Design a binder for this molecule. Structure first.
Ligand SMILES: C[C@@H](Cc1ccc(O)c(O)c1)[C@@H](C)Cc1ccc(O)c(O)c1
Ligand SMILES: C[C@]12CC[C@H]3[C@@H](CCC4=CC(=O)CC[C@@]43C)[C@@H]1CC[C@@H]2O
Length: 250
């Protein structure tokens, strides 16, 4: 029995609802305030999920919050892609059971191009035939894929942790496979899939950072936690002080 898989499967967070009043007209201001409240909500879970991950509390405490604060975009975008694939075969974006974006919501949110990228992503789960086991280990690996260029408080611990999550993903690929040509191709495939989250996550950082700046102008509410992470932590990403870790050069 794989102990590592039992844990991921057990800690996976349940459905989270956005709180969106679906009887309102689909306006930019309402779509985004709801995506924003959706972020606050998802964030509470992400924190609880990350803390229960095997080895996570071995990281220094300031590094525990830094990694969560750097990587939430990618992790949530990925999860959402998976929810989109499993529920509606990647036809729409399944943000929350109460906030499914049709083509029209995509246009009204004014992120049609990001949503188009987010949708290609969700389709990849289908095209690549990702298993829930692979999905889960990839998502944990995503929590460890962005860090300051000066390094963390205890960079050593982090590197150990992340090396292990790499092995586990490699373990879940090998656990039922014939010859090592396909084990290779698959690991290549999934590593490229993970890389692909980063540019998408970078576009959303830019977007939401812009959005918060003119939040008052455009009538868009940001909950406190979202306000603080976007104004404190996102700018370090955008200014190049915090960078994603790619498996392959872009
Ligand atoms: C994810 C873990 C990998 C793992 C642990 C136990 C298992 O039975 C397994 O199959 C894989 C990883 C964290 C190993 C580890 C052990 C001890 C630690 O202190 C630490 O930071 C990390
Ligand atoms: C950041 C954001 C709210 C949080 C959104 C994000 C789009 C991606 C996303 C996917 C989810 O499933 C949870 C909400 C999040 C994480 C939105 C883009 C602009 C808006 O400000």
């Amino acid at each position: 029995q794989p102990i590592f898989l039992n844990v991921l499967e057990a800690i996976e967070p349940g459905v989270v609802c956005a709180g969106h009043d679906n009887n309102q007209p689909d306006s930019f201001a309402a779509l985004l305030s709801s995506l924003n409240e959706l972020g606050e909500r998802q964030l509470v879970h992400v924190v609880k999920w990350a803390k229960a991950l095997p080895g996570f509390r071995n990281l220094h405490v300031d590094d525990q919050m830094a990694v969560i604060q750097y990587s939430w975009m990618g992790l949530m975008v990925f999860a959402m892609g998976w929810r989109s694939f499993t529920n509606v075969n990647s036809r729409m974006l399944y943000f929350a059971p109460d906030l499914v974006f049709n083509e029209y919501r995509m246009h009204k949110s004014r992120m049609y191009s990001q949503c188009v990228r987010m949708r290609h992503l969700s389709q990849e789960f289908g095209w690549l035939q990702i298993t829930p086991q692979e999905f889960l280990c990839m998502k944990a690996l995503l929590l460890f894929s962005i860090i300051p260029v000066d390094g963390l408080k205890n960079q050593k611990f982090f590197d150990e942790l992340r090396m292990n999550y790499i092995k586990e993903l490699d373990r879940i690929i090998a656990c039922k496979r014939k010859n090592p040509t396909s084990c290779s191709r698959r690991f290549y495939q999934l590593t490229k899939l993970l890389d692909s989250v980063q540019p998408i996550a970078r576009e959303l950082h830019q977007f939401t950072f812009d959005l918060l700046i003119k939040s008052h102008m455009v009538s868009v509410d940001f909950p406190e936690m979202m306000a603080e992470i976007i104004s404190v932590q996102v700018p370090k990403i955008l200014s190049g002080k915090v960078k994603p870790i790619y498996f392959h050069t872009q």
